[PDB]
Amino acid sequence: ELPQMVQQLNSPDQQELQSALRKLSQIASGGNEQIQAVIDAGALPALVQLLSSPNEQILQEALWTLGNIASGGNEQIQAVIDAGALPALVQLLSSPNEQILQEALWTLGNIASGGNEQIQAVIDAGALPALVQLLSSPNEQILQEALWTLGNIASGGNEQIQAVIDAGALPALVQLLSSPNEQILQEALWTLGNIASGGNEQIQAVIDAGALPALVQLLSSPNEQILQEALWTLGNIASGGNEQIQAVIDAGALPALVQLLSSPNEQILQEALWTLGNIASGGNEQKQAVKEAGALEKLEQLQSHENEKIQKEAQEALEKLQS
Amino acid sequence: PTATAPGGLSAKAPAMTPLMLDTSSRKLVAWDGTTDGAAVGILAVAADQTSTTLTFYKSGTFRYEDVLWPEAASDETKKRTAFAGTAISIVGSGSPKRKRKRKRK
Numbered sequence: 438e439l440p441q442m443v444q445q446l447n448s449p450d451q452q453e454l455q456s457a458l459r460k461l462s463q464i465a466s467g468g469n470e471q472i473q474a475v476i477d478a479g480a481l482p483a484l485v486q487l488l489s490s491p492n493e494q495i496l497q498e499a500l501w502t503l504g505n506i507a508s509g510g511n512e513q514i515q516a517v518i519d520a521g522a523l524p525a526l527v528q529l530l531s532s533p534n535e536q537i538l539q540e541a542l543w544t545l546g547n548i549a550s551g552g553n554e555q556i557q558a559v560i561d562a563g564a565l566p567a568l569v570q571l572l573s574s575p576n577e578q579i580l581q582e583a584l585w586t587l588g589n590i591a592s593g594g595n596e597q598i599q600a601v602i603d604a605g606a607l608p609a610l611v612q613l614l615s616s617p618n619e620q621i622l623q624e625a626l627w628t629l630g631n632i633a634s635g636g637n638e639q640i641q642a643v644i645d646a647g648a649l650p651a652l653v654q655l656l657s658s659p660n661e662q663i664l665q666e667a668l669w670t671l672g673n674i675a676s677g678g679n680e681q682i683q684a685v686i687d688a689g690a691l692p693a694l695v696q697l698l699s700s701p702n703e704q705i706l707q708e709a710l711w712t713l714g715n716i717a718s719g720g721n722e723q724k725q726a727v728k729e730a731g732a733l734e735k736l737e738q739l740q741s742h743e744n745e746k747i748q749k750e751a752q753e754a755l756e757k758l759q760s
Numbered sequence: 761p762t763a764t765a766p767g768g769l770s771a772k773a774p775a776m777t778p779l780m781l782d783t784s785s786r787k788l789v790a791w792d793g794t795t796d797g798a799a800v801g802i803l804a805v806a807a808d809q810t811s812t813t814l815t816f817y818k819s820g821t822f823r824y825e826d827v828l829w830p831e832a833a834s835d836e837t838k839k840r841t842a843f844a845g846t847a848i849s850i851v852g853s854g855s856p857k858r859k860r861k862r863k864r865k
């Protein structure tokens with residue numbers, strides 16, 4: 438039944454085309470085994486062709502189908518790439534139509550949720566220059582979707598992270614840390630976290646951008662979600678070299694981190710113990726700063742926590758500090 | 761310091777892949793993650809099924825994060841104790857995952 442609908446995507450009859458497009462959209466939402474059935478029927482070249490359609494209703498429907506196919510596995514994301522979707526999607530980034538724009542962002546973000554080769558394919562198609570421009574957008578809906586795709590791109594390897602840095606995304610992300618909008622702030626924190634998860638040169642770029650003063654201030658936040666992301670970013674920066682570990686101490690992170698060791702929130706606690714454990718694995722100067730903050734007695738006490746994850750993280754942190 | 765040995769890989773293996781000995785071919789293959797204490801080294805240069813010679817580390821201190829552990833290896837302590845009887849040394853692990861997918865309709 439499925440290869441008839443694929444042939445019907447190029448059929449001159451308007452009712453035939455739209456009904457096939459609607460049925461195929463419904464199948465593309467029914468799990469990876471159903472997504473594969475659509476791909477094996479050869480719908481992908483026809484759906485990509487419809488992204489050039491002068492009919493906004495059809496364009497939106499084909500774009501929605503592709504976005505749901507891109508939510509599948511890496512083999513299904515690659516099938517979307519091999520069908521030439523990326524050049525069409527990068528063009529839809531210059532669209533004055535906010536509905537098509539948000540849908541193109543959602544599809545690109547889902548493609549950037551695949552492997553390193555999938556993320557590199559998004560980069561090679563020149564998606565990053567348009568995304569950095571969308572970071573200055575007054576449209577809160579478009580800004581979040583652009584921040585979401587940027588974050589999924591920065592979730593790849595070191596070269597994929599460096600591509601985000603070289604595009605000039607870091608100054609905007611840092612300015613977005615001062616945002617009163619909790620959703621935009623969370624997304625700007627999530628991207629920075631993925632950038633700091635790479636190597637030492639990527640971690641340094643984050644420090645050079647001036648992310649640490651805002652990151653340290655966000656530790657005094659009553660928002661557990663903002664708190665977890667600010668902590669995860671500071672922890673990833675602290676997983677770098679001693680000079681990078683020193684930049685964390687210089688900003689005044691330690692008194693806030695030590696205060697967070699009092700938390701009954703096992704999620705905040707595990708991340709606070711991990712961040713200090715990374716700072717503790719540095720040189721003598723950094724170890725002395727941790728001891729000076731009063732972490733030693735806290736780390737030693739948290740070794741008696743009932744939860745094995747907290748117990749192990751406290752043990753690892755205290756070990757790295759005293760060695 | 762890096763050692764060399766004949767390679768008997770069945771698929772692509774990047775740098776930091778743990779290696780074990782294949783008793784049949786007498787060549788080095790990727791460590792299964794099921795045979796306890798069978799890991800002999802860590803791949804230094806990315807290789808595959810066509811590669812004749814593997815360049816690997818037979819000694820050194822490596823972080824747990826840096827090593828590309830196989831899917832079959834589930835136990836954290838069994839991974840740490842995989843290089844038992846060798847000059848290799850392991851450290852500690854992280855916490856979550858970060859690849860976001862959004863399915864609608």
Ligand SMILES: [Ca+2]
Nearest residue numbers: 490491492493
């Ligand atoms: Ca039109």
Ligand SMILES: [Ca+2]
Nearest residue numbers: 532533534535
């Ligand atoms: Ca408009």
Ligand SMILES: [Ca+2]
Nearest residue numbers: 574575576577
């Ligand atoms: Ca607005």
Ligand SMILES: [Ca+2]
Nearest residue numbers: 616617618619
């Ligand atoms: Ca607000």
Ligand SMILES: [Ca+2]
Nearest residue numbers: 634635673676
């Ligand atoms: Ca790291």
Ligand SMILES: [Ca+2]
Nearest residue numbers: 658659660661
């Ligand atoms: Ca709260």
Ligand SMILES: [Ca+2]
Nearest residue numbers: 665666669856
């Ligand atoms: Ca996290």
Ligand SMILES: [Ca+2]
Nearest residue numbers: 700701702703
């Ligand atoms: Ca609790």
